[PDB]
Amino acid sequence: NVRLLTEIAFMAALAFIISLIPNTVYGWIIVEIACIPILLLSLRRGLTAGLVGGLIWGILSMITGHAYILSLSQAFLEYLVAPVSLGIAGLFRQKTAPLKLAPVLLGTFVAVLLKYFFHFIAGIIFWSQYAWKGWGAVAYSLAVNGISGILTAIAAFVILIIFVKKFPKLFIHSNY
Ligand SMILES: CCCCCCCCCO[C@@H]1O[C@H](CO)[C@@H](O)[C@H](O)[C@H]1O
Ligand SMILES: CCCCCCCCCO[C@@H]1O[C@H](CO)[C@@H](O)[C@H](O)[C@H]1O
Ligand SMILES: CCCCCCCCCO[C@H]1O[C@@H](CO)[C@H](O)[C@@H](O)[C@@H]1O
Numbered sequence: 001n002v003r004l005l006t007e008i009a010f011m012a013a014l015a016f017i018i019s020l021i022p023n024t025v026y027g028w029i030i031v032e033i034a035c036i037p038i039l040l041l042s043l044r045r046g047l048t049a050g051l052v053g054g055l056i057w058g059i060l061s062m063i064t065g066h067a068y069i070l071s072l073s074q075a076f077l078e079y080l081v082a083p084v085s086l087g088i089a090g091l092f093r094q095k096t097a098p099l100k101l102a103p104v105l106l107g108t109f110v111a112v113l114l115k116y117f118f119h120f121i122a123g124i125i126f127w128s129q130y131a132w133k134g135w136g137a138v139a140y141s142l143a144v145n146g147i148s149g150i151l152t153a154i155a156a157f158v159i160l161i162i163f164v165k166k167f168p169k170l171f172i173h174s175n176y
């Protein structure tokens with residue numbers, strides 16, 4: 001009870017602190033390293049924990065003034081649904097030894113793809129006034145959010161491979 005809750009809370013606060021690190025490549029093409037703590041949380045504690053972690057992270061972003069909000073529905077999509085959706089990594093939780101790297105990677109792939117799918121949808125609806133010269137709404141959003149999603153996946157792969165090799169205990173919960 002108290003262990004699980006403190007972990008959800010610490011991973012959400014860490015996601016938020018990490019989102020203060022400058023992460024822009026160009027305009028909205030970004031490297032979203034703040035996903036990582038929520039991915040770690042979901043992989044270790046499962047679907048529900050991760051969902052709740054992402055929800056808390058999203059709320060922190062909004063209530064501290066760090067979220068970019070264009071409307072109620074845009075905020076719902078990009079700062080509730082999108083961060084929550086990272087919890088899908090938890091379907092790839094490993095409960096028993098030995099820890100394999102592949103599930104970690106697949107979970108991450110799927111979770112980051114899902115998050116950036118929601119950003120892609122939002123890009124079409126809410127951000128198309130910024131589209132580059134000659135680019136339609138769909139094309140612009142696919143580029144921006146596709147690229148960000150790939151870069152974010154990259155960063156998550158690199159960090160999580162390091163954690164697997166150097167801190168494998170992180171990925172498997174044990175009582176005792
Ligand atoms: C549910 C658990 C919640 C724990 C979250 C506590 C950590 C959040 C602190 O954020 C701070 O917000 C300030 C706004 O006043 C910013 O100026 C500052 O840069 C930033 O560091
Ligand atoms: C692509 C989005 C939806 C796909 C969700 C399907 C995931 C199936 C997860 O079951 C698997 O069960 C094993 C035994 O428990 C785990 O050890 C393993 O790591 C886990 O991967
Ligand atoms: C991080 C990169 C973001 C991924 C963007 C890829 C979008 C691919 C959409 O998947 C799809 O699902 C089915 C129902 O949703 C649709 O019938 C199908 O036509 C659609 O293409």
Ligand SMILES: Cc1ncc(C[n+]2csc(CCO)c2C)c(N)n1
Pocket residue numbers: 028068078118119120122123124127140141144145
């Ligand atoms: C084309 C386009 N431009 C901006 C955004 C907005 N956006 C992208 S990632 C993100 C969350 C990072 O905190 C937000 C709000 C978008 N979806 N698509």
